[PDB]
């Protein structure tokens, strides 16, 4: 379990900047800026509690009943979806310092296609990702619907408590040595250029394609490039099945990010 262990350890430096609208005129500097170590395999929203705890004593409003506003993360004045692994959002945007800069924002109009944060069950969404992944792999979602309620719960809990053993045990109960399809998502940079993303249908029954073999579906996302998966370069002669079974994210999907060579 060497590779996966390395993926579970993936961690980024995150600079969280709290908009002034959240705080009271005069509050100190330290409250407005959080510095944290966030895993690649998790959701930003899983660290919101940590942000509330640090800025609650300076809120410029009563969060219990004052009014209804929406909260969401932003990168360079651009809404960021929290429903993607942190590592995936990173690859998507990327002495030399490597860090992710996030800005907390509030508003009345919730940005289009953005799911609100603090009406947002991260655990439910996540569980469904794995449901979908199970169906794509087996043609049915029975393997995950067979987990006891406890396992499903121990499963999400491993992400929060960061328990590798539990995650590996449950996530394993959802895999195939002979998948019908590959749960694959392809994206481009949100930073430079235009942004596109796709979920091509890639049958596996009786085949063993390499990225090259399916470059047709890969290059389609944006109509020589480099294939980035889990923050690293991937050889085009690599087997799709091995790449999936080894580098898939904590939500069950394999993500490929294309970057200009």
């Amino acid at each position: 379990n060497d590779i996966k262990q390395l993926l579970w350890n993936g961690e980024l430096n995150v600079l969280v900047s709290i908009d002034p609208s959240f705080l009271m005129k005069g509050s100190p500097r330290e409250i407005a800026v959080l510095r944290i170590r966030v895993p690649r395999e998790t959701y930003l929203v899983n660290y919101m509690p940590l942000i509330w705890n640090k800025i609650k004593s300076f809120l410029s409003f009563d969060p219990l009943t004052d009014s209804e506003k929406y909260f969401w993360f932003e990168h360079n004045k651009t809404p960021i979806p929290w429903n993607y692994p942190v590592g995936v959002l990173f690859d998507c945007l990327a002495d030399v310092l490597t860090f992710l800069r996030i800005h907390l924002v509030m508003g009345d109009s919730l940005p289009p296609t953005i799911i609100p944060i603090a009406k947002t069950q991260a655990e439910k969404f996540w569980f469904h990702q794995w449901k979908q992944v199970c169906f794509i792999l087996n043609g049915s979602s029975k393997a995950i619907m067979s987990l006891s309620v406890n396992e499903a719960r121990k499963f999400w809990g491993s992400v929060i408590t960061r328990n590798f053993q539990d995650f590996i045990e449950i996530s394993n109960k959802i895999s195939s040595s002979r998948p019908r399809h590959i749960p694959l998502i392809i994206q481009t940079s949100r930073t430079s250029g235009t942004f596109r993303i796709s979920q091509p249908t890639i049958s596996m029954t009786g085949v063993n394609p390499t990225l090259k073999d399916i470059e047709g579906d890969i290059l389609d996302v944006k109509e020589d490039v480099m294939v980035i998966c889990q923050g690293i370069e991937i050889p085009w002669h690599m087997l799709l099945y091995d790449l999936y079974s080894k580098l898939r994210s904590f939500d069950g999907f394999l993500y490929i990010t294309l970057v200009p060579i």
């Binding site: 060497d2 390395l6 430096n13 600079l15 490597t98 860090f99």
Partner: peptide, 25 residues
């Protein structure tokens, strides 16, 4: 066997490059 070694090595670098200056965070 060998592709795994390349995977294991690139990720190991990744973690280290991404952990650099983690003292500031």
């Amino acid at each position: 066997d060998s592709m795994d070694d390349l995977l294991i090595r690139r990720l190991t670098d990744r973690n280290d490059k991404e952990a650099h200056l983690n003292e500031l965070f």
